[PDB]
Structure formats: structure tokens, C-alpha cells
Write a protein that binds this ligand. Sequence first.
Ligand SMILES: C[C@H](CCC(N)=O)[C@H]1CC[C@H]2[C@@H]3[C@H](O)C[C@@H]4C[C@H](O)C=C[C@]4(C)[C@H]3C[C@H](O)[C@]12C
Lengths: 221, 221, 221, 221
Amino acid sequence: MYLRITNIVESSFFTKFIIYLIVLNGITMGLETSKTFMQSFGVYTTLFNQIVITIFTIEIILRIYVHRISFFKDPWSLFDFFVVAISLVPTSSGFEILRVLRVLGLFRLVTAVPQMRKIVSALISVIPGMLSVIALMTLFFYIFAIMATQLFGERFPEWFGTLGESFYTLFQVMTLESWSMGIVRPLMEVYPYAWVFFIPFIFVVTFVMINLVVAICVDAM
Amino acid sequence: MYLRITNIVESSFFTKFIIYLIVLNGITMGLETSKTFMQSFGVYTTLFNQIVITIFTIEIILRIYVHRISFFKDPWSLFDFFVVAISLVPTSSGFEILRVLRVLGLFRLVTAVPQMRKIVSALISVIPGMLSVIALMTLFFYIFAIMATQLFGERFPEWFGTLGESFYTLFQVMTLESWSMGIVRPLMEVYPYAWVFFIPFIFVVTFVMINLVVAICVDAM
Amino acid sequence: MYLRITNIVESSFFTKFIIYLIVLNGITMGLETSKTFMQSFGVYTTLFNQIVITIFTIEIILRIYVHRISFFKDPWSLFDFFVVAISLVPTSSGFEILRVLRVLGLFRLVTAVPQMRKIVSALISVIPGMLSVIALMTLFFYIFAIMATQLFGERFPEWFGTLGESFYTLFQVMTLESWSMGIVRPLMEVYPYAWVFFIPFIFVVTFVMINLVVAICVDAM
Amino acid sequence: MYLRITNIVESSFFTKFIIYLIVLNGITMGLETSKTFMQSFGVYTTLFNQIVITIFTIEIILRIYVHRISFFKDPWSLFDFFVVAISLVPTSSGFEILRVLRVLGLFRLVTAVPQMRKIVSALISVIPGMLSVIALMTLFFYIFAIMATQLFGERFPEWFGTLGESFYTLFQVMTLESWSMGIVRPLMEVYPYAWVFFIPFIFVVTFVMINLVVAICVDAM
Ligand SMILES: C[C@H](CCC(N)=O)[C@H]1CC[C@H]2[C@@H]3[C@H](O)C[C@@H]4C[C@H](O)C=C[C@]4(C)[C@H]3C[C@H](O)[C@]12C
């Protein structure tokens, strides 16, 4: 009977149908946002969603028997699996965080549809030749986040009171958002040489970013 | 009589004269801005504009007989047509929006003048090899917009209360404008882990943008 | 006697001496900033500056006789000439604007020193292959500045009340500084669809900028 | 006895052990941040750090005898030396700044570990072909900083009252952070033409930055 199901799963119909449900589920997730829609089609959608998750679980089971070990060595299948699994965890209990993670299922449209797979794949394959720089950077933040914490945390708890608060603030400085009016001008009211810390940090972190980008451009060419 | 008009329309004079009116109309559209100018040359300009639109309709009609079906398969002509048409719709009625859309007529100067066409044409030809990434991105926003709405909309109606309000805010976050001081720092006063939603969102949306640009550079070569 | 001066002007000494004065003048311009310095070396510097301008005028005269027509066909000499001329206009009269323009003389260090000339020259030579895009852009701002003025000027005079105010505000939007929190969120309190005007404007103006940069990168390669 | 130590220092063990201490020291420097941790493991950590600095000084001494003059002509060793030296300066006296500079020791992890060296080395090698543009820029800031001081310092002491205050503000304008809402819009309330100073400054400083980046991309190829 193995081959009987394999010619179902491997069919065009099967894929087209799933892709069809992804888009339907996606559309319905956005309608589930409208307070108006939910007082009308309230029960309608509550059932429609328990229906779709069933079809998807069936799909992932069928896909598993047709593929066995190959299934759990496909990044895309694993994504489909974990995403369907999250959706399976009961609507209540623990925190509601899981209920929100459901909408990550709509990334199945990247899985189920080729060409989408293609771009995601092209985008991701660029990451490996970055990890040496990403590591350098992370070490860099960590060194500066520790300095910032012990230089500015006492008088500026909100922004630098904690290693993590300093990571957060430095990230903001890196994105250059309000770094002068919001952070360094206030800081200099107490610590007039604070600029000696932040101008260099901005130069280095900016410089590295520019190189990181150059990398990706020259290497693709 | 066909050829009699065709040697008019196709002449050097004809185009030079239209290009002349474009610039004349354009200049006059900026003077129609001055509150001072309109209390003086008020009626003067009101007539000058009704004249120009006539010459332009004549122009588009003459251009149609000389070109027939070819006219309506030329992007530039279609633009010229639709732009003259918007201008034809009566000054009153409906909304005043149309009255504003008239100034889009000055993009004719891109049509009537070569070299302008050339650049616009080059800029546009880059769009096709982007639609997959633009598509990816749009899906991405949509997934994150739906999550933000159900995670932050209750306590932050202005920014996340609505799927579209969430779209707008996320776009702003993408441009990185006030994203920490204006949005995430306030958000964290209620949801201390909000950063888990926005730092990743920023990385992904930035990363993709950086690639989107790389694309255009290497591919142009 | 022509050759007598030509072997002065064309000497290394001559150039080295002028470059020496540029740097001295430059240093002294920054000291002329200190309120402390000016109550001490007040008269000292007032004379030192009238001295330097004399030596420079002599220099530009000597350079002219050794070069005649070639002098006024050298961009660099013309700069040196006009910059020395501005410095010659009496300290008083008209407005003080001229007194400030003096410090532009320190760009003589770009003239008098090669290698500096080289970079300025490389940087400028990139401009010609941009004017078609710069023109497109300027037309673009002009069309949108006029729309913004007649759409938002009434209720938002400070930002959009004038064609120029609209140019200014749109430039700010283009640099993406406070565009949402500072301009478009306030605007939407009155005009809820204002986003239909600014999101497109941001896309187009951003898109063009990215291409403008691609241009310069691919063309150099 | 020379070779006896040389086969220690040059061993795989030696480096692995140092790299181990770097990471151990590094981790412990972040725990020294927790107010909680220090009331518990207070004395524990105070000793652990005096131990590590000893091992590191021994390390740098052993490395010196095995390398002598070659040691002091290796950038990385010089760094390791100066970084260990800063750490040697007593916890008290002068300012506490030195105590903070200790954490710069964690950049050793870049030294002791290859591949890190590799990236840092690649990033740095790009700097030489920039110094002409960095030089141009610095001259540029200096010229505009002096002008801003004498044009805006009187009525705007905080932002332009001082050559250095002007440098800082102009850098902020260069990063484009709050430049219109925070600086030029306020400035124009007194000096309606201030925009003539800042829009050009922004164009030039942006233009140069765009070229600076182009440089690194084409030249890397
Ligand atoms: C195309 C129209 C007439 C239409 C026709 N059928 O001939 C031409 C009539 C006069 C021409 C301008 C001028 O001559 C030379 C300029 C310099 C350079 O060339 C770049 C562009 C020019 C502005 C140019 C633009 C365009 O070309 C026209 C408007």
C-alpha cells in the first residue's frame, strides 16, 4: 500500500491543495484580527482552524511514511513539522505565546512553493561567510557593553544598568537611532568625555558593517 | 488626409512645442502656489490652464490617429493619455484629490523628453529581478504585522491596534526611525521581552534589504 | 624679467612656502575661535591675518603673469583667485557673511597640495554620470513638493505652507529623519490617508538613491 | 635552557591554555557586573582575577625570551603586552578609567585565536586606501566646524559654542540623527537661511561617504 499513498503525496494535486490551504489559512489569520469579524463569524472560524490543522497533520504524517529518514534531514520538512507541531499544542495552558507562534505557519508558503525556497536558500547561503565577522562583532559588543555598564550604569540605570541593558542600548546606538539627542548628549551632562566612548564605538561598528556588505557584494561577483 | 497630420505630429516642431508647454505648465503650477500671485494674476492663470489642457487633448487625439493601436500599447502614451484624462475631469465634484493629481502631468516632461525616458526605463527594468524578494518581504511583514497586532494592540492601540496600524509601525521600524526611543522602549515598559520580537525583525528586514541591494549591483555588471 | 619670476613661482620653495602659510592660517583660524585667545593675542592675530592676505594676493598676481590665459582656465587657480578675492573685501560693510566665507580659503590646502587635488578630482568626475538621475529627482521633488503644499499647507503651515517649506520637509523625509513620529503620524491625525502620499514617496526616493549608488559602483568597476 | 622554555611556549598546550584563560577571564568579567554575584562570590572573584593577571604576565615574559626583538615588532604581541600592562597598574590611584580599560584584554581572544586575526587583519588592510578621503573629510569638518561656531555659537552655545562642540554637532548631522527636528529647524527660527549651510554640508558629506564605500568594493575585487 506504500506506493498507493506515495502517488498521492507526490502528485501535483496534493501540493496544489496544501498551497491552497496555506493561503486560505493565511487569509483567515488576518481576518481573525478584526474585532468585527470575530463577533460575526466567531464560531465559524474557530472550527475552520481546528479543521485545517488536522489536514496538515495528516499531510505531515503521509509525508513521513513516504520519506522516513529523508524527511527528518530536509530543513524544509523539519520546519513544516515543527510549525505543525506548535499548532497542535492546546489553545490554553502555559502562556498564550504559542497561540501567536501559529501564524509562523504562513511561512509554509515558502516551503510548499518553490522559487520562494530558492530565494530563502540564496539568502541563507550568504550567512556562513559572515560568522567570523559576526563573531568579531559579538565579542566587540560584549566588551563595550561591559565597559558601558561599569561606566554609566550608576547614574543611568535604564540605559546601562545591566549587561543586557547595555547590549540593548548599544544596539540602538549602532542603528544610530537617537544616539546623540537621546543618549550621548544626556550622558555628557554628567560625563563630559562620554563622546570618547561613543564616537569610536560608532566608527568601528559602522566600519565593520560597511565591510560586511562589501564582502557579500564582491563575493557574489 | 492622414499623412497631412502625420507630418505635423511627427515633426520636430510638434514635440519641441509640447515640451515647451510642459515646462510652461510646470512653472505655472508652482506659481499657483503663491497666495500673493493668485490675488494678482488670479483670473490670468485660471484661463491659461484651461487653454493648455485643450492643446494637450488635441495633441493626444492627433497622436492617436497617427498611431491607433500602437498608441495604446506604448507605456508612455498610455501615461500621457491617463494623465491628460485626469486633467479633463471637472474642477469640482467628488473630491479635490483629482485637482492635485493634475500636477502629475509634469511627469510628462519624462515622456516628451528622451534621455529622461532612458533613465526611468533603466530604473524600472531592475524591478523584475526583485519581485521574489519583494514577495518574500511582504509575506514577512504580513506574518509579523499579524503577530504584533495580537501581542501589542490591546495596550498600544495607536501603533498595533489594527493589522494596518501594525503594517505602518513595522515599516517605520524597518526605516529604523525612532524604533527604540519611540516604540520598543515604551513597549518594554509593559512587555519586558518585546525586544525578542523587534531585534530579530530588524536583523531579518535589514539583512534582506542588504541582499536586495547586492542583487542590483552584481546583476547590473 | 618674466623668466626671473617664473623660476620663483615654479620653484619648490614657493609652493612649500604657500602650503606652509595655508596650514598656518588654518591653525590661526581655529584659534580665532577661542574667546580666551582673542582677549590675549587679540591685536597679534588681527595683524597676522592682514599680513597673510597680502602674501596671498602677491602670490595670485605672480601666478597670473607667469600663466596669463592658462591661469583663468585652471579650475584650481580660479578657486584660489576667487577665494583670495573674498578675503580682500573689507572686514565691515554689507553683511558679515563674507568674513565667515574667508575660512573657505583653507580649501586652498586641496589646491596647493597634490594628492588632495587627486581625490577631489576623482570624486567630482563621478558627478556627470548622475545628472540625468539628479534631474529626474529634482523634477520628482518639485512635483511632490507642489502636491504636499496644496494637500497639507493649510493645516500644517510650518512644514508644508510654502513650496520651499515643502521642499525642505520632503528632503527631511528623504533622509528619513523623524519622518513618522515627527511628520506623518501628526499629519494622519487630520488626514488619515496621508500615508498614501508618503510611503510611495519614500519607496521611490529610496529606490532611486540605491540605484544612484549602484551606478557609481558598477561603472567604476 | 632557552630551548626548554621555547618548546613550552611554542606548544599546542600553551596556546590552548591561554585561549582557555581568555574565555574564563572574559566570562568572569561579565559576572563581575551582577550586583547579586558580587555580594556572594565577592572575595572569590577578587582573587581569581589577581591569579589570571599573573599567569598572563608570566606568559608575556616567556613569550619575550623566545622571541626577543621579533616580539616587539609583532603588532599582536605589542597589543598583548600593552593590554597586560594596563592590567598591571594597581586597582587604585589616578582614575578608575584604567580599571575599565582592563576589559579590553578580551580582545586578546582575537590575538590568541587565528581566523580572528585573519578578519581583523583584512578589515585593517582596507584603511590605507582611505586616508586621503579621511584626510579630505577631516579638513572639511574643520572648515565647516569653524564656520558653524562663528555663525551659530552666540545664540546656540550648547551645539556650536565651541570648535569642538561644533565638531560633535556636525558629526551628529553627518549620521543624520535628529538633524532637522533637533538642530536645523530650531536653528532656522533665528537664522531663516541656516538651511544653506546644512543641506550642502549633508550632500557633500553623504556623497563622499558613498564614494568611500564604492572605493572599498571595487578595489577589493
Ligand atoms: C527631442 C526634442 C525635440 C523632439 C524631436 N522630434 O526632435 C528636443 C528639442 C530640443 C532638445 C534639447 C536641446 O536641443 C539639447 C539639450 C542638450 C542635450 O542634448 C540634452 C538634452 C537637451 C535639453 C535636449 C533635450 C531634447 O532632446 C530636445 C528637447
